[PDB]
Amino acid sequence: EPVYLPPRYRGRIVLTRDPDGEERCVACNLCAVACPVGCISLQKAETKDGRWYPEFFRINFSRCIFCGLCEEACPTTAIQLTPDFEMGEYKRQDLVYEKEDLLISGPGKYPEYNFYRMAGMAIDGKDKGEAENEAKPIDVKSLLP
Amino acid sequence: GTDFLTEAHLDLPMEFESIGKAGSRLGTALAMAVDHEINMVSLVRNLEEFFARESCGWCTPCRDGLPWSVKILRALERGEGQPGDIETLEQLCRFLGPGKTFCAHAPGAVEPLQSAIKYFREEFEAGIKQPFSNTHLINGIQPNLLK
Amino acid sequence: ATIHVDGKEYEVNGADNLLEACLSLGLDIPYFCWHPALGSVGACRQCAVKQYQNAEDTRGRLVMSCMTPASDGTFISIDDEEAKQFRESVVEWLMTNHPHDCPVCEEGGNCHLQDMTVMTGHSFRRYRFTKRTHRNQDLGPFISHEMNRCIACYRCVRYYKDYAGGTDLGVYGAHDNVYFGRPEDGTLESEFSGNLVEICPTGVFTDKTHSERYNRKWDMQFAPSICQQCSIGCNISPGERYGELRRIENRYNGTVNHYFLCDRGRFGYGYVNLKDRPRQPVQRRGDDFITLNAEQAMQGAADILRQSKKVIGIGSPRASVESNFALRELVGEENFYTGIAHGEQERLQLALKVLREGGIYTPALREIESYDAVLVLGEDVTQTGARVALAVRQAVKGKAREMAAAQKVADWQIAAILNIGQRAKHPLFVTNVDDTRLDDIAAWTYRAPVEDQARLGFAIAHALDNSAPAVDGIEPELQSKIDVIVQALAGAKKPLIISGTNAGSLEVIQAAANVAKALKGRGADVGITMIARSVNSMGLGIMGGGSLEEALTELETGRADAVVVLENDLHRHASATRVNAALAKAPLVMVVDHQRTAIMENAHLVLSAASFAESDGTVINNEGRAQRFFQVYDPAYYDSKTVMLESWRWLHSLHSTLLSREVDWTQLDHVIDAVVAKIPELAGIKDAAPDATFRIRGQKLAREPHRYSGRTAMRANISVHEPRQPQDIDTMFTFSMEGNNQPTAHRSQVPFAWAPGWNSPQAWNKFQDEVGGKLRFGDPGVRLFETSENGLDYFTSVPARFQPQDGKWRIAPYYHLFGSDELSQRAPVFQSRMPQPYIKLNPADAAKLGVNAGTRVSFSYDGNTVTLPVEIAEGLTAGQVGLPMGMSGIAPVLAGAHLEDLKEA
Amino acid sequence: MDYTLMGKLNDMVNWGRKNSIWPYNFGLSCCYVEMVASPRQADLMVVAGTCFTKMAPVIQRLYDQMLEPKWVISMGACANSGGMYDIYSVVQGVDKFIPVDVYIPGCPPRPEAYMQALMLLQESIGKERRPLSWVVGDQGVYRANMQSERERKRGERIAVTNLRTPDEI
Amino acid sequence: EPAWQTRDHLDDPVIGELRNRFGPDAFTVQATRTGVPVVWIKREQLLEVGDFLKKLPKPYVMLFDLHGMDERLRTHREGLPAADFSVFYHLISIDRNRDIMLKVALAENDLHVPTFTKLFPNANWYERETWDLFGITFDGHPNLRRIMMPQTWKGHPLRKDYPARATEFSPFELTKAKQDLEMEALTFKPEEWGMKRGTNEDFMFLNLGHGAFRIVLQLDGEEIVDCVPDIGYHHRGAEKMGERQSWHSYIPYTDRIEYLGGCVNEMPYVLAVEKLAGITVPDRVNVIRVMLSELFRINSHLLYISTFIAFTDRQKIYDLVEAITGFRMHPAWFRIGGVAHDLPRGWDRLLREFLDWMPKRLASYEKAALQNTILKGRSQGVAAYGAKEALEWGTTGAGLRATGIDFDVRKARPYSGYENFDFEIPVGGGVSDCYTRVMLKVEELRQSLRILEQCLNNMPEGPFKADHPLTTPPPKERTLQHIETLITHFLQVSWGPVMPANESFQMIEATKGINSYYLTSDGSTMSYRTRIRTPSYAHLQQIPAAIRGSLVSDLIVYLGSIDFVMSDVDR
């Protein structure tokens, strides 16, 4: 029979996407510093609209203890531990998963959270004042006191 | 910028010390009369809107605490007040007193609010109708249910 | 003075305010609007403590500790519940409008607002309403603007306007819509605008150059280093990640550059990350370029150098003391040439003789701020020695400081000081070939050719002391202005004379020495400052050697058949045609360098030297201070085939292979011992930093913070096996976090400032004996020479007045902070900031030529015709033509030379 | 596929070595207690635990006592790389001193991950070429460069869209 | 006056007794958050103070712990004697239900202390480990050799100037060590192991192999005359790792010590960190932590009882633990100020199914163990010790209570709201043999099931994390929504939470005895010192004193009867 795993199971690590389809990771490096083993490496890059994203994102899975501290430290719910354990390899170098080996085509366990809808930094499709609990920018030259 | 006084304080002489002992100050000695048809929450809301938009922006408590009191008073005037709003107004009054801010604009701003909460508290408590919430539900995360 | 904080008795300075006195004691009070270099204004209301009337008082009163003097017998409480509640309320008020931005904010992990939010214990939000938002501005290529993150602490405007003297940053608006920025989009115009990224406690002003390749502070590998972009020797903390230099932070030195850098030093580091740098030794054989490792490169170079009859070596002021000494030992003392021209060397040696034989104290950069009158002769300080210009601005504001001190106003109450001293200021007299950036605060600016500037200096010295040689032919109005200068300088208690080698005139240096001697003879506490050109110009002057013209003569006559060029492009100090001909004649050229220069096409062997980021060494300040720079990172940690050694290591192993046919990769301390044994006037460089056996209770000093991440993944794409940690045998620092960086550790070299609870640049407070003072166990660096017991004699070589001769055009040097320095102008971010090459003309000369503003003229220098567009310079004088020094094709050696065949192209 | 240093019976030999694997489970640390013959008889060594420096010689000696053909399966992050113990007393990986044929990430891995590793080892054994006899033929072992399991399983992993929320059991 | 408040314990009667005996200027009382009176003693009075505490009317009978501390980099030593190193001695009075800590300050050039083995025999291994890891010599010790590292090891790893991270691997040193293991029996000198009379032509030396460890046996025929066990083959450097991780990121390392324990191992560490942080956790956190610790205690007891003589009960426990925490063996689920997540919706059904299925298994295990006559003949009377031997060797848990001493931490010194649960502490007669220990483990299993039933019946509704600002990490929904919570989360997971400089101590009843964490903060985001006292160390040290004159098979039965794992021994 197939093995049953609870939804909270700490298996294979993925990077997820927001409901708009873009990757959730803003390359803030909180998961890498929170990793007690030090097996996450990434670089911040920025698109033309100003959206932060990981230029590369690699996890050394020969080193990972599947403790879930990176997922706990993620402020965008990008990095997630999923119910999957079949990860054996022939070469240890093939246990280094790059970004194309981690980025799934959906939101994972957090289906609706979008960090960029909360952040005040402007990107494409979200001007200043268009985030949650944000007022429109009042110009300093405006006539109202 | 002066504290509200009631009918019982109408018999006091218009001196500095006599009105200072009553919980107010003589000020410019030009008094303003408020009739029963005026809601005190709306009146204090108008006062605090004036004091908040006439801030100079130099110091933190006036610049960032008068607008919070203004938004609380707008919520209470629309009936959208939540628990902890009156306590927030009271601690804004306590922390915008003399010496806490850079100049005397903010103590004079919080004197009407303090006096109106002291006397006409029933209107301010009548403004509160909704349960307190500033956090929405995130689908995969169980909230920390504080007591 | 005695204060009682929470029932504990402390002895403080009564002239301090309570915030700085308590931060000096190790107590933690949150603060935003106060800065040690800016004073107290009481804006943010964060620093509240509870002051009691006496010991038997319990009610007390909340006071601002930054605005309260630390007078004797004061009673305060920091951990009082009312004070803690008020400080948490101030943090909450700041948090009401702050954007949800920390993951996508460059300030994260380095943010004073984050630190003070955590320090007050505020972590629960109860504000439910909207947040105000702001549009951003484009502030240029260096500073990124994000106005949402502002807490309106006014530090940026106070620094940029009141401290740095800038004019294009301000505060606009009102009640809670205060906006901090420029009146319109455009590049920030101050040369010191880059310090906004450390002055701003939030992420409003951020390092845009770092933001392109951003990494967090805990992920950096830091080292203490010295800025290589001019001669001031500001202490820096370069930090790298993934094999590339990521950022330059200010490293606090209480004696030199305390909190501030200039924009050249902060943003011109990008040449280190260039992809055309030599990363491996390359030997040219035929048309092929064979790549070698270190061993066979040393063997082949030693064989060819042993077969040659005479080998000469050409040093550079870019290279460190150890590198130039190693080249001097390899080729011999008599065959070693300083890589600078003969006139440049003459001016540099005269400046050295004035500094270490003139009997007049040369101040450190921090000490410049305490002088009462400044005369600047010929040196465009803001474009060549910028931090001296910032210190001169502080020295000028010293008069308002004195006037406020006469009214018993405290030293830290900056607003009262600026109100008392409205526009009164100490006298500043600047002299240049055109207008300077110091003219806004200068009492007088003299725009004249360098002969006339020298004549003005000689006339001032004669008017102060009649034993000085007199000047014949001074106009009466110029004589009246000279008398104004003399009355301002003679009445000053501490006059300061600043000059340097960038004017291209020996007579300007002689005139400045004469003025300083005349003021010394009158009993004044006079100081003299010399601005050199490059990071180790003074060290190369102390070491000595022949000029570049003598080396080119040796190559062209055939007496030398092998030349070793150390870190020198040779086109900035001599004509490119002559250098190319001499290097093409020589049958062996060996270039030891870290940048791809134009002489490597003639080079038979290129040794891939390390830059300052990948090397250790000693450089000598313009004031004669020996300072060590330590290696930031191992270049071979990520690319295993990189052979990028220190220049002294290359040359020492080459000398060892020349003698005993065995390579010898030595140690830095061995080379320093060789320097102090052979050159006795460089013996002070031993005490600049402790040797490689120095330990703090047995452990080394860490280069990276404790929370350095990716230890088992950063190289995992190359190989899943984690490599050996690179071993540092040269210095006391380790290439790991397994080391010490405690604020109380007994050392002077601090790679970066971090304390628990203090992740921002405010962590430097923990590393100081008093906040804004020196480092706790002394600032690093040692003065090589002391003040001479007896001074020099008066220079009697008074030059004649400038005469515009027809057909000739005297080249007036124009310096640029972005472009004149060689390596910094190779940096990509400077190319956007670099001004277009304009040839500056007088209106009368342009009318004589028929030339308008913007048309292209062609001029021939050294038989080479080059074409530039014309900019009209009203401040220039007739018969002079203005050229931008150090740009593409215009060598700084052209300053003072004449020009031929200036005509419209 | 590439190989790194008369046909039907060689395939039969590979099939016999594949379907007959006698493991020697080395205890070492907690990976074995998650999972819970002489080394002369065993042909598979399953190292599952932290490689301490004081018993790296024990591992090396018990590996040298085994007889060819021999295969090594390393279970868990400690045996793969040292895991969370980058520390003075721990060898950073089993493959520092003995060659490893299959690696399993985890801390500890599940027992069915050990079954999956056995399946992978069976495929690797079935697609390898070894000398038939010690007197006739080439005396070289040709390991086959298998396609990595993450390149093979990339499509079905990246195709994952939604997962169950962690609020349930 | 909270339970985490800094106290000097000057009102403790032992302080007055020491003051009346030695004088007021003979010791320095340090105010800590350990909950224990800490007194700094001169080195020349250490044996006098120890022998005085041995002879009190309610005497201090057990040396709970003894270790060292490198004080050179510690910058917050206000009210402390001048020390480069220090040695601490944690002593417990069971009759007084109290404990005291004695601290001896040592200068770096004179790192020797008088031995404590004449007063307390477990000081032998404790002082050997202190010499091995800190370089502190104990004068008068019989065999002061290394116990964690090999004998040919350079330096002392717990010193601050010793590098923590793994050095470069050397195949040559591995081949040399394998050569030494090849010729170890050939050149076995019976003096580098503390033995004597090595080869009466009848003494034979044996090397042997719940974890793997080697014990050297001296045999007269079939009888054991002397034995020394060689430990340290499972040394992971967990304390050195404690100095290299932040307070938050060290929690998985707490899990991996005593890998049968899981949350039981997490509990004393997070309780000591919360003492340092000034955190009082709410009641729901207490009940969640108690429930998970009792589930893991049941799992460990089932494994001990089964391996003494099985799988389905442990599978159900691991299924419930995997549902709650996401992982079976090493949950890493306790947090500073709470737990990682709330309980998943549906945990009631799983716990109810587990509790409605376990009493039948309880009856089965009682029939299989207590009523088995062959087991009652095989396990009774072999390697039995009384209360005097249990006290002097630091024996805790089932052995100590099998000697009749009613000392359980959950009742004597209650923690995590254990005083709100109704349960019994089983004690035995005066004899602690194998059968009495197995009986006590079965009765403890029944009482843990009672505790789980009470956890299920009234589970409090409320927060799973404390309201404190030092709760690490903050609640996740407020982190994703609120900026000040985001700031707190950002700084806590990256630089680390800042614990103010203090010392804290928490002792708990683990699955095999008393497990304790002693934490020293120097005001930073990492621990200055993390000392882990584990029961298996003291239980392994007692073995040579209980099999003098027994057989090798009796040694095997004794090893099976003592609940210990080697990761707990070596940490």
Ligand code: SF4
């Ligand atoms: S699960 Fe733990 S070990 Fe694995 S990458 Fe995340 S933080 Fe690191």
Ligand code: SF4
């Ligand atoms: S913590 Fe999350 S958003 Fe930040 S770098 Fe890691 S995966 Fe990306």
Ligand code: SF4
């Ligand atoms: S209280 Fe006064 S100084 Fe402060 S912001 Fe308001 S108006 Fe300005």
Ligand code: SF4
């Ligand atoms: S300025 Fe500081 S508090 Fe604000 S978003 Fe950036 S890191 Fe966070």
Ligand code: SF4
């Ligand atoms: S931009 Fe920065 S420095 Fe200027 S007021 Fe705002 S927070 Fe302060």
Ligand code: SF4
């Ligand atoms: S003044 Fe000179 S030394 Fe200082 S930062 Fe600028 S270029 Fe560097």
Ligand code: SF4
């Ligand atoms: S990988 Fe994890 S479970 Fe396995 S031995 Fe190492 S610490 Fe134990």
Ligand code: FES
């Ligand atoms: S630091 Fe004192 S009010 Fe800002």
Ligand SMILES: [Ca+2]
């Ligand atoms: Ca070096």
